[PDB]
Symmetry: C3
Subunit: 122 residues, 3 copies
């Protein structure tokens, strides 16, 4: 947690919920994540690269999963910037994502559980 004030680019990997392997959900988020070290608060910002498909995202805060906040949304470029706090950048951050298939059919909804594994701030 010992980090000085400023803007740093923090890398991440999305791993499967109960497997130490890469999750297919990783491709919905732009790497690296932005890190603002302000007033001793670890704020992580990341571009959700498919606004239409990814409908909801929740990240663990104080022991429970809470819906992420939208910094700014770009409906023309099909992207959005999301903001969330992390308790520890050393523990695999459990996250649940709700998605929608672009198919022209009755069934299209989906949802998956995955873990965000953060490297070191730069």
């Amino acid at each position: 947690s010992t980090l000085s004030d400023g803007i740093y680019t923090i890398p991440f990997v999305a791993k499967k919920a109960n497997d130490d392997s890469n999750s297919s959900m990783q491709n919905y988020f732009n790497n690296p994540a932005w890190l603002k070290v302000k007033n001793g608060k670890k704020m992580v910002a990341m571009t959700v690269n498919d606004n239409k498909t990814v409908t909801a995202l929740k990240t663990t805060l104080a022991g429970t999963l809470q819906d992420v906040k939208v910094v700014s949304e770009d409906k023309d470029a099909n992207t959005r910037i999301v903001e969330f706090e992390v308790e520890d950048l050393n523990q695999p951050l459990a996250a649940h994502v709700n998605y929608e298939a672009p198919f022209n059919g009755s069934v299209y909804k989906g949802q998956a559980d995955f873990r965000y594994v953060f490297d070191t701030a730069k």
Copy 2:
């Protein structure tokens, strides 16, 4: 082929035409591909992440290469969703792509052959 009804995310890799190595053409397609298991028909959908550059794409169906169908096109975000049927998700699916360089010159056209190698549905 033994798969139940529903929406599943199928991963893929683009390999070189006559080499078991990754093809540079992989970066024109968004991973993973969407899979709709409806009425015993293996339908694969994928985002072509550069609408202007990638001009044509054909995938092998019943022994011959046929031009892929457009689900929906996004001219503002420079993307499009394409749909194609696969005979077997265990054989390397041969595909031919036609592309155009964004350079301001007389010569800009190009075309390449590659293989889609599908993993398992999720």
Copy 3:
């Protein structure tokens, strides 16, 4: 340097300034880069996939770093096509990038040094 006339797709990796490891800045540029072999001039074109964040980019030419030229800019899709000459496609091309965080705060600016390592034209 012995290459015939035409359009070829050249792959690249962004490595850390003083480390032979991948740079986080790699995700701001679309792979592969376009190569036009016209009148014995090695011209490299690449899509900067985040127009708003990446504010400036300079590539080494004749021993010094010079600001890259804009082929065409897409403000709707948040992209731009940049053009620059390379002295040798065998030496790690030193580059300096200026970036801006999308956070809603006083501090957001940043800048990093990295090297472009080019493979072979296709």
